[PDB]
């Protein structure tokens, strides 16, 4: 319900006619949310079996 839905859509409905744009924005937010650097942590040596 990101766009073109506020005001008229029911709380439990989605508008099929606006699906592509809503999906598009949803993916965009998904993309933006992950824009971060993969830092390196400390390490330990494993001695557990295999």
């Amino acid at each position: 319900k990101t766009v073109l839905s506020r005001g008229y859509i029911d709380n439990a409905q989605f508008n099929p006619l606006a699906l592509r744009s809503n999906v598009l924005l949803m993916l965009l937010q998904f993309t933006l949310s992950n824009l971060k650097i993969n830092k390196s942590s400390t390490f330990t040596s494993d001695v557990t079996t295999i």
């Binding site: 073109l4 506020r6 005001g7 008229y8």
Partner: protein, 94 residues
């Protein structure tokens, strides 16, 4: 000395249309006048430059129409005007 306020000047958010007064008559001319008056210029010093100009306004739709509420609400209004009842009660229903 090195005042950032004098070095980091950039247009503010909603700059192109912020000063537009809420009206329906001649929004672009009115907005243009508001910008001129807001900037501190007085008409007696701008002279002929003030008569024909026009500026973007919030009252004008992107399609080029006079709007009085956010376009989403206009979409909502027309949508709400057509909502047939989902479940109706009639004697012959099986």
């Amino acid at each position: 000395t090195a005042s950032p306020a004098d070095t980091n000047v950039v247009p503010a958010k909603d700059a192109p249309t912020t000063n537009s007064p809420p009206s329906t008559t001649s929004p672009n001319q009115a907005a243009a006048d508001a910008n001129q008056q807001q900037a501190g210029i007085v008409s007696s010093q701008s002279g002929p430059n003030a008569v024909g100009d026009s500026a973007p306004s919030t009252s004008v739709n992107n399609d080029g129409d006079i709007i009085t509420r956010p376009t989403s609400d206009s979409i909502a209004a027309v949508a709400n005007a057509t909502k047939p009842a989902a479940v109706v009660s009639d004697p012959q229903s099986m």
